[PDB]
């Protein structure tokens, strides 16, 4: 249960994820029910962006001793094209363009042509 949970945590970083919250609930090693929690990277919880930045999937696995819960939560990366993730930028990120390298004039000159 430890080895396999990294097997999906690394599979997205080779695929280019922004962050993930994987939590394996249910009983592990005994009668008591516990919860695994391997969080990493950027991952938000609040706001309207949770609908289109994070895709949530929850599943159950059938075994002989109990039913374990898995929440495979991934935070989608951003792309202005919109083919890997949402088109809309973050609500807090401020994309400021750099100033263009213009050299200030000291001489009054004309460029009439035609």
């Amino acid at each position: 249960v430890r080895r396999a949970c990294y097997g999906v945590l690394r599979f997205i970083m080779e695929s280019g994820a922004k962050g993930c919250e994987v939590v394996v609930s249910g009983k592990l090693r005994g009668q008591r029910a516990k919860s695994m929690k391997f969080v990493d990277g950027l991952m938000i919880h609040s706001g309207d962006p949770v609908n289109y930045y994070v895709d949530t999937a929850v599943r159950h696995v059938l075994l002989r001793q109990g039913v374990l819960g898995i929440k495979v939560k991934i935070m989608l990366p951003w792309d202005p094209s919109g083919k890997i993730g949402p088109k809309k930028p973050l609500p807090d990120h401020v994309s400021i363009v750099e100033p263009k390298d213009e050299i200030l004039p000291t001489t009054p000159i004309s460029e009439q042509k035609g």
Binding site: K88, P89, L90, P91, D92, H93, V94, S95, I96, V97, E98, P99
Partner: protein, 132 residues
């Protein structure tokens, strides 16, 4: 309760440290500037970011600000920090010398000088603070 956070303030300094000439003083002026020189996602933030810029402009015209990298003030600070007066703070004709530090030079090499006149000793040792 209207206190701005980092994204209102860390961004507004990037508006100033890179675009100083492209702004003015009025809010709606550089509100209409900051929409094209910065991709702000929302409208309410667009009024938020520029609102701190005009308030800091009310400071830059009035004095120097710490977290600001403006090309025109530092060159003004440059010319006062490469400053050299035509006379030095060392080229003095009357070098008043204490009677005891007169004695230290007589044993050294430069003992007899020209522009060094000697003062009078202070009477009575009274130099430290009364305790209490």
């Amino acid at each position: 309760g209207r206190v701005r956070t980092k994204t209102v303030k860390k961004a507004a300094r990037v508006i100033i440290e890179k675009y100083y000439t492209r702004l003015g003083n009025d809010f709606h002026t550089n509100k209409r500037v900051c929409e094209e020189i910065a991709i702000i996602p929302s409208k309410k933030l667009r009024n938020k970011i520029a609102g701190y810029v005009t308030h800091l402009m009310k400071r830059i015209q009035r004095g120097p600000v710490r977290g600001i990298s403006i090309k025109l003030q530092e060159e003004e600070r440059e010319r006062r920090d490469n400053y050299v007066p035509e006379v030095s703070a060392l080229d003095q004709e009357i070098i008043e010398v204490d009677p005891d530090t007169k004695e230290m030079l007589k044993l050294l090499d430069f003992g007899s000088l020209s522009n060094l006149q000697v003062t009078q000793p202070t009477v009575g040792m009274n130099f430290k603070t009364p305790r209490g």
